[PDB]
Every structure is written in structure tokens, then in C-alpha cells.
């Protein structure tokens, strides 16, 4: 009635809508994954260099699981500036850079966008547009020495500041005054580098603190460095959706005996329609079949005569029917699945043609 926009319907067959089986769950199967980036040598390094001699490392072409870095609580400071740490495993850039060094506890806050200080002006300066994260942690039991660890030095005197992403290790005798010095300290000549006095007896803010800053680079090369992916469990014989190695689509997955040469990954039949795929994990050739669908139709003897109808499902096997889930005696035919009309063994003329040589009429509905 809604489709015909009328309050009366004549006897006959009418198309109304279509039946499509919905998916049941999602299955993603990405390959075996490998090539983890070497973070262990960064955060478990034997020793870090000086702050003005900060160690620079480049990371490229490897999976970078930031989950283990994020969930670790052993680092006192974990401040990500460009983006939220949680989503770092989702988006990624084409390179990573690590700056590792040691400072005092008080100098920890100086390494941030829009920050200034002795370290921020003479040892390492960062741009205000810097994106990435900073991980700092105390290493008092290791870097600090009971006799005074002077192995760590910091630049104290310099005529100008430091540009972003610039490292200076010059040992030029700083000449505060106008009196030139030929490499010898004097009244107005001093050493720009001063050795830290790290000791275990030093209080909070004076203990050595190892700091590593991670930045992400977007050179026109493709992005290759970010976290791994997730692999679900493969199911079969159920209309589901899949994401096999970027090839996404729905259907029912079965086993296939077809052969692939050792370099293809998936095939197709004709007109670029994916028809067979290989799971990137166990290396076997699967097979994809479209989920069953088909328009439904209504057979009625006329609103004037009666008010009970029969339902036809076109080209759908009588295995998955689902308020009309059981109804009356279900009949199965080549044309489709017939619901509400009982089968007879007689033979009369045709009233409302149904298909494949069979059709229905009103006695009930037969």
C-alpha cells in the first residue's frame, strides 16, 4: 500500500523491496609484521653525551611501536607537544629523529616550544613549531658520581643564541670584553663550557636527568615509520567484512584449491572483480563469494477479495529466511523461496505467474 500510494490493491504480483544479508563481524588479517625500530639502545644506552654535544639519531623504514614507550611509567617526564601520544600508532611521518643528552633536573622544563634558558639558548634550541615528544628520566644512580661527575659539560657563555635544530660544540674562549685573547683566558676571557657537578648527595633538581626528544619528519619520501597493526582471527562460511592487507570488502570466505605463482598476492576473474585472495599470514589461497541478496515480491488476491498475501524471495536458497521468519509452510523452488502459500500436487491454469513454470492462485492461497 505504501509503495503504490493507494488504499486499494488489485490482484497480482508487485515488487516491493530487496533482502540483503547483513554482515556478522569484522575480520582483519595483516601480514606477519617485522622490522621493529631499535629503541632499546636509545633508552637503555650505556651513556649519553653532553647537552651541547647531544647525540643525534635518525630512524627510518621500521615499525615503531609507541605503545611500549607510552605505557611505561619508569620515565619521570613524558610530554608530547605536537600531537596526542595515544594516536601516534595511527598516524605517522616519513622519518624520526632522536636527540639524547643529559641535563640537570631543573633544566628539564627548558626543552619545550616557547621556552628559554641557558640550555635553550647555548646548548639546544627548539622551534616554536616543533612537533613530537620529550621523554626525560632521572639517572642519579648511574650518571652522578660520588666524587663529582664532571664528564657532562654545558655551554654557559655565547655572544648569540642557538638556531633551532643547530648543534654547536665550539670551545672558543668567550671574550665578554673588548680585549682580544690569543687563546688564553684573562680579565674579559673565559671558558664557555662548564662541567656539571653531579653527585648523589645533590638534592632534587640537581640530579642528572637523561632526556631524549623525538621528532617526526615529513620529507616528500613516503611515510614508513609508525606502530604495528592488529590481526584478528580468520573465520569462514559467514557473511563478514574483511580488510586483507588494504583490500577491503564484504563476502563469505571459503577455501580454494587454485594455484598462485609465488609472487602474486590476489587474483580476479574478469572486469577487475576480486575473486581469490591469499592470507598474508599462513600463505594459503582463500576464496570470496558475494553475500546473498535479492528483491522480494508480494502476491496478493486483491484488497477487495481477501487480506492475506504470499511472499516471494527471488533467487535465494531456503536456508536463511530472516516478522516473517516462520509464517506458514515454506516452499522451495528454482525461482526462489515461497512463504505463506502451501504447495499442491494438482495442475490448473495460471492466475499470477510466479516463475520457472510454477505460479499461485486463490482457492486460501495455493
Amino acid at each position: 500500500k505504501c509503495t503504490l500510494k493507494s488504499f486499494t490493491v488489485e490482484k497480482g504480483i508487485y515488487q516491493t523491496s530487496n533482502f540483503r544479508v547483513q554482515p556478522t563481524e569484522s575480520i582483519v588479517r595483516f601480514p606477519n609484521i617485522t622490522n621493529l625500530c631499535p629503541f632499546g639502545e636509545v633508552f637503555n644506552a650505556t651513556r649519553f653525551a653532553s647537552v651541547y654535544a647531544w647525540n643525534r639519531k635518525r630512524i627510518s623504514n621500521c615499525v615503531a611501536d609507541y605503545s611500549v614507550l607510552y605505557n611505561s611509567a619508569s620515565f619521570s617526564t613524558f610530554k608530547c607537544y605536537g600531537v596526542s601520544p595515544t594516536k601516534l600508532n595511527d598516524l605517522c611521518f616519513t622519518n624520526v629523529y632522536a636527540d639524547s643528552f643529559v641535563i640537570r633536573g631543573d633544566e628539564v622544563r627548558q626543552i619545550a616550544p616557547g621556552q628559554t634558558g641557558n640550555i635553550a639558548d647555548y646548548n639546544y634550541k627548539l622551534p616554536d613549531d616543533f612537533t613530537g615528544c620529550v621523554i626525560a628520566w632521572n639517572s642519579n644512580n648511574l650518571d652522578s658520581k660520588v666524587g663529582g661527575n664532571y664528564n657532562y659539560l654545558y655551554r654557559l657563555f655565547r655572544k648569540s643564541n642557538l638556531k633551532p635544530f643547530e648543534r654547536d660544540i665550539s670551545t672558543e674562549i668567550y671574550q665578554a670584553g673588548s680585549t682580544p685573547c690569543n687563546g688564553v683566558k684573562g680579565f674579559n676571557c673565559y671558558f664557555p663550557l662548564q662541567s656539571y657537578g653531579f653527585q648523589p648527595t645533590y638534592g632534587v633538581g640537581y640530579q642528572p636527568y637523561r632526556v631524549v626528544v623525538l621528532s617526526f619528519e615529513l620529507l616528500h619520501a613516503p611515510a614508513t615509520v609508525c606502530g604495528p597493526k592488529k590481526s584478528t582471527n580468520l573465520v569462514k562460511n559467514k557473511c563478514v567484512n574483511f580488510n586483507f592487507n588494504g583490500l577491503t570488502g564484504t563476502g563469505v570466505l571459503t577455501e580454494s584449491n587454485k594455484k598462485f605463482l609465488p609472487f602474486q598476492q590476489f587474483g580476479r576473474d574478469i572486469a577487475d572483480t576480486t575473486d581469490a585472495v591469499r592470507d598474508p599470514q599462513t600463505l594459503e589461497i582463500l576464496d570470496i563469494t558475494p553475500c546473498s541478496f535479492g528483491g522480494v515480491s508480494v502476491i496478493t488476491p486483491g484488497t477487495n477479495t481477501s487480506n492475506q498475501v504470499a511472499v516471494l524471495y527471488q533467487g535465494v536458497n531456503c536456508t536463511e529466511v530472516p516478522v516473517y521468519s516462520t509464517g506458514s509452510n515454506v516452499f522451495q523452488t528454482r525461482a526462489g523461496c515461497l512463504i505463506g502459500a502451501e504447495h499442491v500436487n494438482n495442475s490448473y491454469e495460471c492466475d499470477i505467474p510466479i516463475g520457472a513454470g510454477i505460479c499461485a492462485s486463490y482457492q486460501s492461497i495455493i
Binding site: 602474486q264 598476492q265 587474483g267
Partner: protein, 234 residues
């Protein structure tokens, strides 16, 4: 560590026919018993091949077909790049018994780049220096190779075949499977071929259209050049 050489061997280049060699798999899509038309950079059929019997420097152009009809693993080295020195990022390749090994940076070469065999071999004196780089990759008989470079991806397609004809290329067909892929982009204009202490063929590829036939096993058995002659166009 290298010096010059006096036996400046320059045998004049001969010319021969290519026949129907230089077809490689274009895509990683399995297909079964189907005729597929594709536009790609191929070596045109029945073309001119610049037979070489010291080693010059040839332009790379778009893509290069390189063949060596050797006996028991003769060919070893390849040098690719624009300037072939420490000015611009160079590329070096050494074929090995198992696979190939690739280094991507600026090496300083002399006029005589060669490996050297000691009689068990131990000699690496092709270049002299290498300052900075990151990318290193490790994994009777005519050995065919197709070298291409498209949008930051350098591809090497390989094939080995046995033959008994002595003079030139045989009259057979064999698709060139993909072997090595490189997700790296560096400018390349020229390349050379490395000597060992030997005839090889070179061909230049052009963008054209081809028709391929796939059998029941996803292997190419026949190809037809689209724009060669009226019958092939039909």
C-alpha cells in the same frame, strides 16, 4: 684503491635484432587464461640492440633492458647515478651467489672500477671513499634483467635461461618475473657495467601498448605489440 690502465680496450659496438625479448610482469594480480591489454614502458619488438664485446658510460633514459649470455656466474656489478662520484647520491649493486646487495650513497670511483679475483676471492677496490648514507639492502646461460625507476621506486626484474646458440639472442619468449623492489627515490641519468679480472646486450625501452595472454597458471605465454604493423594493430 685503484690506478689507471693502458690496455684501453674499445671494441666498436655491433648491432643486432631484439626479436621478441624483454617482457615482464606488469602487475601482482593473478589471472587465469585471459587476454589483457596494457600500456607500459616496454622494449619494442624487432628493434636495434647495441652489442658490446674500457667500459663506456651509457645514458639510462627511462628503462633499460640488460642481458648477459655468460658461463657460470660471470656478471657481478652495476653502477647507477647522475654524476657517479661523491657529488651526487650514487647507487651501487653487486650480484651475489644467493641474491643481490645494494648500497645507496656517494662513492668515489676512478677510471678503472673493477672487483678483482684472488686465487677464495677477496678484493674490493671498485671505489675509494663513501662519506654518508643510510640505505643498504641485502637478501651457456643467459641472464636477463630489466631495470626501471618510477616515482621513487626502483625495480629490478630478473630471469635466468639455458641456451646453446652462440652468436645472438634466441627465438623464444619468457616473461620477466619481479625480483627486487626499492622504495627509494634518487635522480639517475647514466649507468655503467662492472668488469671482473663477456659480451652483453643493452636496449632502451619506450612507452607503448601491448596485449598479453595468461594461461591457466597465471603465466605469460604470448604477447602482441599493439602499434607495430597493421595486423598487430588489428
Amino acid at each position: 684503491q685503484c690506478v689507471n690502465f693502458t690496455t684501453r680496450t674499445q671494441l666498436p659496438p655491433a648491432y643486432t635484432n631484439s626479436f621478441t625479448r624483454g617482457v615482464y610482469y606488469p602487475d601482482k594480480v593473478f589471472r587465469s587464461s585471459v587476454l589483457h591489454s596494457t600500456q607500459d614502458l616496454f622494449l619494442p619488438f624487432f628493434s636495434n640492440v647495441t652489442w658490446f664485446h674500457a667500459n663506456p658510460v651509457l645514458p639510462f633514459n627511462d628503462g633499460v633492458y640488460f642481458a648477459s649470455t655468460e658461463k657460470s656466474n660471470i656478471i657481478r656489478g652495476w653502477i647507477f647515478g647522475t654524476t657517479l662520484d661523491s657529488k651526487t647520491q650514487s647507487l651501487l649493486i653487486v650480484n651475489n651467489a644467493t641474491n643481490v646487495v645494494i648500497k645507496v650513497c656517494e662513492f668515489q670511483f676512478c677510471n678503472d672500477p673493477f672487483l678483482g679475483v684472488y686465487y677464495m676471492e677477496s678484493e674490493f677496490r671498485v671505489y675509494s671513499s663513501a662519506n654518508n648514507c643510510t640505505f643498504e639492502y641485502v637478501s651457456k646461460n643467459l641472464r636477463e634483467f630489466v631495470f626501471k625507476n618510477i616515482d621513487g621506486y626502483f625495480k629490478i626484474y630478473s630471469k635466468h635461461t639455458p641456451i646453446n646458440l652462440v652468436r645472438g639472442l634466441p627465438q623464444g619468449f619468457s616473461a620477466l618475473e619481479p625480483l627486487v623492489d626499492l622504495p627509494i627515490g634518487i635522480n639517475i641519468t647514466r649507468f655503467q657495467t662492472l668488469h671482473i679480472s663477456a659480451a652483453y646486450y643493452v636496449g632502451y625501452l619506450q612507452p607503448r601498448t601491448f596485449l598479453l595472454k595468461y594461461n591457466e597458471n597465471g603465466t605469460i605465454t604470448d604477447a602482441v605489440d599493439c602499434a607495430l604493423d597493421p595486423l598487430s594493430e588489428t
